Design a protein around this nucleic acid. Structure first.
Ligand SMILES: [Mg+2]
Lengths: 155, 78, 124, 24, 72
RNA sequence: CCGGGCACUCUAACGGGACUGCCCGCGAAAGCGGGAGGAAGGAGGGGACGACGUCUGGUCAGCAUGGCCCUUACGGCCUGGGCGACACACGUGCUACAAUGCCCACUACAAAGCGAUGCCACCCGGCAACGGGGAGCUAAUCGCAAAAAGGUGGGCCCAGUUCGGAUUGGGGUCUGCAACCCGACCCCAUGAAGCCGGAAUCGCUAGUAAUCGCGGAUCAGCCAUGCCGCGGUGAAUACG
RNA sequence: GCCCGGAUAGCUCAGUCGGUAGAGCAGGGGAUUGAAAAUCCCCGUGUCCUUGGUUCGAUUCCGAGUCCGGGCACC
RNA sequence: AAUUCUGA
């Protein structure tokens, strides 16, 4: 990617919610391109939402995905024999990708044997500011700021 | 695995057969490791060819369905 | 319920329990079940003495399973250890006897790797 | 799995037919 | 050679070294009438082959000595 | 499925169209950015094609051929053994450690190729592999053939297990004169290690990676998980 | 024998100047190098050897018991 | 801030 600034592939709007983002989240739950056996789980989670909080799985998204967005993380560099892993801002685009990813991984960690349960629950704890995905958020934010010593390295 | 027959070479019977009448000596050289040892043969030792030389292998009850090649090793020091 | 030998499986379907017996698998499972009107989707947790002893019938009476098959299987191998046929050996030596690649993969019937080596590539 | 010779895919991956995959 | 004729080997000494080859090799071979068989092979044996330890692969020559002394 | 019909689908043959031609921004031009129109843009996506030359690379064992060597054997034939040998060690691959799962029952959608001592519709026996009969097919007209994952509903409920299938014991079918070495499948019983893997390390920027199945070649049969093609679903990231 | 102090994280030590328990090093996960550390974030672990009395009760306030640490003699 | 490759 040395010539062109690459291209931001387009997300097809959801086919139930109509969100170009409610799909980006399913895509990460898609193993082997089986979007049917993936979106199913997701939609089976939205029913665990409406069956454990009148809150429509919509604000449980715009909130759990917003309380996970890391403002700044660490991206290492080397000026020459310099093992400086500088902290810096995050591209609004990147933020989302890092979020969704940590959300799936975290989901895939809970002890719930089924699946949608895990996604639903992790979405609840993350909206309610206390999910394993946010644990990685603060963990990442600790590294950040704590190294503001390298502020003159904003490449 | 065979299904209709016992694919036992010509010279096998032709030879052995006369040897069964009164129970002859024993020394019966061979090159038919691809056969079978049907009963009545008991006692009569056969000089099976392992590819290099003749092995004086004795015959007893238990060993029946087995073949001649499953009694003359082809490699050494296993 | 002490069914065959010393095996008391519970909390599971009375169709997989028989599998946990040396000499019984999926086959003979959904076999003694049809030949005894015993619904497979039930449990050892609840079953009439009749179903037990009846099971002990079409099981411990049909094919004489652990101990005695075990005793026979070894007896056959023991027979292969009479004069020593080709199958007899390779068994006497504890190796596989089904025409297989021994130059590599075979740790199953090979007694773990004993890296006992020593070849070289560059002295003085 | 694709090596369990006593199932559906057991024969699919194998390319044969048996008691565990009769001829339609 | 001494394992084909039937004789028995004892590696009294073998020692590697820096890059590749061998520094010193002292072996004891037994069996009936053994010295008389390895007595003629007592000298310096020359080799001529493409050098593997070269980039161009040039044709090179190598020398190595073989001494023989019985156990009296 | 009938007669009947070329409007579709498709099949194969010849053409159009895209060229930075049209608008606007930059530049002297070349050229670049963006916008529209258009099914399609700035080499639209793939092939095929790979310069003077390097590597005294590899290939006398595909063939040819200089030169050296043997010619009642360094040639010719034959039964049989060996190339498959295992205390070890490295590479490419296959199946897995599982619940986005496995097993069970029912029902659907492809493409590319391939079939006369050849592929086999459908019955009957055998749980089956497989065996009888026999029709159709020189094949856009009959068959190989069911695609699979999936959709669908019923039970397992996290235990090395209904996961995983190595190994071993018993029984059979099929080619082939002949399956001990040394074949492929069928059934029963065996159910070992493996709970994502130290140091290191491989591929891919899009219908790509991953996953799923189908065909062909050689060939009596096959150790093909290899190779060459075909198609179903179908991502993340690229600041620099 | 007399005079003084003290064990609490694997180790070393602070501490309502009475309720509310803590640091450094060890250790683990990650982060992690061209290679180990140096950078870098996050957690479990207890009557403070310890015998109690006042205090509402005490890791800290009295006696005092066991041992530990440091000094002072005589013989 | 990290050595070496003989001799056709
Ligand atoms: Mg040197």
């Amino acid at each position: 990617a040395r010539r062109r600034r690459a291209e931001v592939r387009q997300l097809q709007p959801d086919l139930v919610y109509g969100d170009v983002l409610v799909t980006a989240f399913i895509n990460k739950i898609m193993r082997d391109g089986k979007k049917n056996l993936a979106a199913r789980i997701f939609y089976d989670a939205c029913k665990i939402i409406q069956e454990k909080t009148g809150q429509e799985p919509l604000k449980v998204f715009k909130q759990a995905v917003e309380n996970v967005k890391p403002r700044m993380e660490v991206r290492s560099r080397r000026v020459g024999g310099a093992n400086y892993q500088v902290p810096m801002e995050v591209s609004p685009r990147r933020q989302q990708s890092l979020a969704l990813r940590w959300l799936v991984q975290a989901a895939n960690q809970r002890p719930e044997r089924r699946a949608a349960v895990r996604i639903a629950h992790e979405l609840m704890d993350a909206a309610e500011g206390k999910g394993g995905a946010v644990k990685k958020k603060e963990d990442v934010e600790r590294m950040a700021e704590a190294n503001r010593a390298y502020a003159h390295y904003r490449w | 695995s065979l299904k209709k027959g016992v694919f036992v070479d010509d010279h096998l019977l032709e030879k052995v057969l006369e040897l069964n009448a009164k129970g002859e000596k024993r020394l019966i050289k061979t090159w038919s490791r691809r056969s079978t040892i049907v009963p009545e043969m008991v006692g009569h030792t056969i000089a099976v060819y392992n590819g290099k030389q003749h092995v004086p292998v004795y015959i007893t009850e238990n060993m029946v369905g087995h073949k001649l090649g499953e009694f003359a090793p082809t490699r050494t020091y296993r | 319920a002490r069914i065959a030998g010393v095996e008391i499986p519970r909390n599971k379907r009375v169709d997989v329990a028989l599998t946990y017996i040396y000499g019984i698998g999926k086959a003979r499972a959904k076999e003694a079940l049809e030949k005894t009107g015993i619904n497979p989707a039930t449990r050892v947790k609840d079953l009439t003495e009749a179903e037990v002893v009846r099971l002990r019938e079409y099981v411990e009476n049909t094919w004489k399973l652990e101990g005695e098959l075990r005793a026979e299987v070894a007896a056959n191998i023991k027979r292969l250890m009479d004069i020593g046929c080709y199958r007899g050996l390779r068994h006497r030596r504890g190796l596989p006897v089904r025409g297989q690649r021994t130059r590599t993969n075979a740790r199953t019937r090979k007694g773990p790797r004993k890296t006992v080596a020593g070849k070289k590539k560059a002295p003085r | 799995g694709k090596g369990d010779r006593r199932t559906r895919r057991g024969k699919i991956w194998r390319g044969t037919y048996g008691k565990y995959r009769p001829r339609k | 050679f001494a394992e084909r004729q039937g004789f028995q080997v004892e590696v009294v000494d073998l020692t590697p070294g820096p890059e590749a080859g061998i520094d010193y090799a002292q072996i004891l071979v037994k069996g009936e009438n053994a010295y008389g068989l390895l007595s003629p092979e007592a000298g310096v044996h020359r080799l001529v082959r493409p050098s593997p330890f070269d980039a161009s692969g040039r044709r090179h020559t190598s020398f190595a000595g073989v001494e023989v002394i019985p156990e009296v």
